[PDB]
Each structure stands twice: as C-alpha cells, then as structure tokens.
C-alpha cells in the first residue's frame, strides 16, 4: 500500500505538467531547472591534470589545458578556459572568486605566452588574468585585470582593482595600481610576510572547503546542524 | 501575469503531492540541494530567445527578454540579465566570459533603455555593459565596465579596465580606454583585422565546446 502510493507521484506529474496548460498567457517558463552543465572539466581537446588535492569549485569551469599544484585552490565561479593556449597553476596559487584565467589567441602581435602562475600566488577576487605570466609568491589584487604578457615579478603585489596594461611587467615588490599602468610604491617587508601568510591560509582554507564535495548522505547528515 | 501566477500555484500545488506525498516513502531525493542556475534561459512573461548556432555556456545565466541571434555566444559565467527591456543581442557577437549585459531595473532614474548589442561584437571578460546600445564589430576589453545609454559606434575598441560614461555616443572607430571616458587614438587597420577575425575565431570556438553530453561515470562516483 505504501510505495504503491507512487500514484501521488504520478498525480503530481499531471499538475507538474499543468504548468504547460498554464504557460499560455505569454510564452512563460522556458526554464525547467535542467540537469546538464558541462562545467567542472569541459575538456575541449586537452584535459586538466588538476591534482586530487587542488580544490576547484564546482562552479569553476576549468576548460581545456590547465594544471594546478598540490594545495592550490580554484575558487567559486572562476572560468579557466585553457582552450587556445596552455595554462598552469603552481602549488598554493589560490585563484580566488570570479576569476577569468582564460588566456589568448592573439592581441595585435603574436603573443601566445601560455599563462603560468607559480606557487603561493594569492590571486584576488574577480581577477582577470587574460594573458600574462605570473611569478611565485606574489599577491595579485582583488579586481585586477592582468593583460597580455605582463610578467608580474615575485612578491610584487598588484593593487585592488588595479588594471595593468600590456607588456608592463611590474618589478619585484613594486606595488602597482591605477587604471593606467603606473607603479604606486614599495610598501614593506611585512607586506611579503602577509602575502605568504595569506597564501598558506587560503591553501588550508580551501582544504577546509571539503564540504563543497560532500555526498547527499553527508549533506543531510550535516543538516544535523539544527541539533547543534 | 495572472494566469502565470495561477500556473505557479498549480505547479506548487502539484509539487507538494510529490515533495511529501510520494517521497515520504523513504525518499529524501527531493531534499537534496541541487543547483538551479542551470536555468540558463530564465524566463518571465518575456522569454529569452536563442537560435541554434549560438553556444550558451551552462555556467552562464541568460535572464530576461533576450534575443540571441546567429553566431552569438554567452561563455562561461556571463549574465545577460535584461528583465526590463529586451537584450536584443545581434548576430555573431562574442561575450567571451564573465561579462554582464544589463537593463537592470532602477527607480527609472535614467529611464533604462534596451541593450541592442550589434554584430560580431567580441565583448571581453568582466565587461559590465549596462544599458548599452553597442553597435556592430566592436571590441570591449577585459575587466571593462560601461554605463547607461552608451552607444559604442562601429569599430569602437573600448580597452581593458575602461569605464565608459553615460549617454556617451563614442565615435565610429575611436579607442576609449579610461575610467573617465576619453578618446585616445584613431584605431589602426591591423586592429580592425584582429577584431573582425576574432569574431569568427570564437564563432567557431563556440560552435565547438560541444557540451551537449553527460558524464555518468563521474555521476556514479559523486553518487558514492
């Protein structure tokens, strides 16, 4: 008797269908909350060899040729289209939210230059690394827009929202910034100390986002959070 | 719409007969927090229209009145959120990434106008086009931003990080690449070739990427 009450599941479908008989006043509800989203790998012709410990966020559509190191994260909503030119990510490079680490085809003169990002590279939220190489242990800024062929030297932070023009590879430690490609200052050594601290803390923080890959049973068992 | 509201009620009324009506039979399947952004072409009384040869990425939402033509593409993460007035995206355009095309609703402070994106427009990443009558074969740069009523005329290669101002009818072929909108240089012809060829580049790259599948082995793994 119970489990034969699947008739109520079939009865629901009639009404779950009555949305068709009710989408007539205008063309309504062409969305159906579908299932397919070729996102988390979306291999075009080359596959990412991302590690078993490099947390990528299921929103992050890491397309094509990509490689991430042990401990580095690929945070929420960051597309990495390594489709036309190779990409890579060192161990500890936390490419933060809303990134655009999609490389190039060309821009007005050749400049293939596969984006390679070293270790401990704390990249900021909403960063746009369109076609630059980035060196180890630097801290790109939340909102930065790193254009073609901009070798961001080591331990040189790019400012928040700091667009960097083409070819203007910043020096080491020289904090850049500004809508035009101009330097700002050489801050301090505590700056690099905090760079490394934030890099390792973001690494283990991404290691704390293991709940993102939990199983249905584990999600509903976390739903015990009410009791505690 | 009234009958649209009634439809929401019958679907809700039905959805309850499944939620605990037949699911209570030991089934917590409906209790899973699956995503809902996969409604790429989110709808209203106005709906988003998209032709065949127009790749839409599944990481990208296309909300509001949209008219994606031929060759146009909406790549991974973009949001053509245009509820108020139609996002009349033309043909062969190339949004290319986490961009945004808004007629997003305000308190009619500037009378938000439709965003008639032109043809072969290879908009770059993070561009935040907002009430933009951007014309055809135009380039907008990475991380860029635009403002209400802008008219990026033919071949107007807006540069990276740029912030075009309100109602600025940028001239045809003038490069404006700054936070205060500012003409910089008459564009060269090699840039014209690049912008007119990157159009078909992505047009092909978007007809590629061939999502159109399913990966059950991964589904079976994530099941356990």
């Amino acid at each position: 008797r119970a489990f034969y009450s699947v008739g109520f599941w079939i009865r629901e479908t009639g009404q779950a269908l009555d949305r068709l008989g009710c989408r007539l006043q205008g063309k309504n509800y062409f969305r159906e909350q579908l299932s397919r989203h070729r996102t988390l790998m979306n291999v075009f012709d080359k596959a990412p060899i991302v590690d078993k410990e490099a947390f990528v966020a299921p929103s992050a559509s890491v397309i094509g040729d990509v490689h991430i190191g042990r401990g580095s994260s690929i945070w929420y909503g960051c597309v990495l289209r390594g489709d036309v030119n190779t990409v890579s990510v060192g161990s500890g490079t936390n490419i933060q939210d809303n990134s655009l680490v999609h490389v190039a085809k060309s821009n007005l003169s050749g400049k293939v230059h596969p984006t390679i990002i070293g270790d401990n590279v704390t990249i900021g939220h909403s960063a746009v690394l369109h076609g630059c190489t980035v060196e180890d242990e630097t801290f790109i800024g939340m909102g930065a827009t790193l254009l073609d062929g901009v070798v961001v030297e080591k331990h040189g932070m790019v400012a928040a929202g700091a667009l960097v023009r083409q070819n203007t590879r910043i020096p080491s430690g020289e904090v850049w910034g500004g809508n035009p490609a101009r330097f700002l200052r050489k801050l301090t050594d505590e700056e690099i100390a905090f760079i490394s601290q934030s890099a390792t803390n973001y690494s283990n923080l991404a290691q704390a986002h293991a709940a993102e890959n939990a199983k249905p049973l584990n999600v509903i068992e976390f739903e015990k959070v009410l009791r505690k | 719409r009234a009958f649209y509201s009634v439809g929401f009620w019958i679907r809700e009324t039905g959805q309850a007969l499944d939620r605990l009506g037949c699911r209570l039979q030991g089934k917590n399947y409906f209790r899973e927090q699956l995503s809902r952004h996969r409604t790429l072409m989110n709808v209203f009384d106005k709906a988003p229209i998209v032709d065949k040869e127009a790749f839409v990425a599944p990481s990208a939402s296309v909300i509001g009145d949209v008219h994606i033509g031929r060759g146009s593409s909406i790549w991974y993460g973009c949001v053509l959120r245009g509820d108020v007035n139609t996002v009349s995206v033309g043909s062969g355009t190339n949004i290319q990434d986490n961009s945004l095309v808004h007629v997003a609703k305000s308190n009619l402070s500037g009378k938000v106008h439709p965003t008639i994106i032109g043809d072969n427009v290879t908009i770059g990443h993070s561009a935040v086009l907002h009430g933009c009558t951007v014309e055809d074969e135009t380039f907008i740069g990475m991380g860029a931003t635009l403002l209400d009523g802008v008219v990026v005329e033919k071949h107007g290669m807006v540069a990276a990080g740029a912030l075009v101002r309100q109602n600025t009818r940028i001239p045809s072929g003038e490069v404006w690449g700054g936070n205060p909108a500012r003409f910089l240089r008459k564009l060269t012809d090699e840039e014209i070739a690049f912008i007119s060829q990157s159009a078909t580049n992505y047009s092909n790259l978007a007809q590629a990427h061939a999502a159109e599948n399913a990966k059950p082995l991964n589904v079976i793994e994530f099941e356990k």
Partner: peptide
C-alpha cells in the same frame, strides 16, 4: 518494498480516522 515497521500502522490509522470523519457525517 515498504517503509519502516510501524509507519505502515500510522498510515493505515490515518485512513481509518479520515474514513471515520466522512462516516460520522454519513452515519
């Protein structure tokens, strides 16, 4: 092909209680 033992008894009881409510008006 059934739910936990005792849940069935409660589901049967609800129908017998609802049958009684229609029945109370009927008889």
């Amino acid at each position: 092909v059934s739910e936990d033992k005792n849940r069935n008894y409660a589901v049967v009881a609800g129908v017998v209680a609802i049958v009684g409510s229609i029945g109370w008006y009927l008889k």
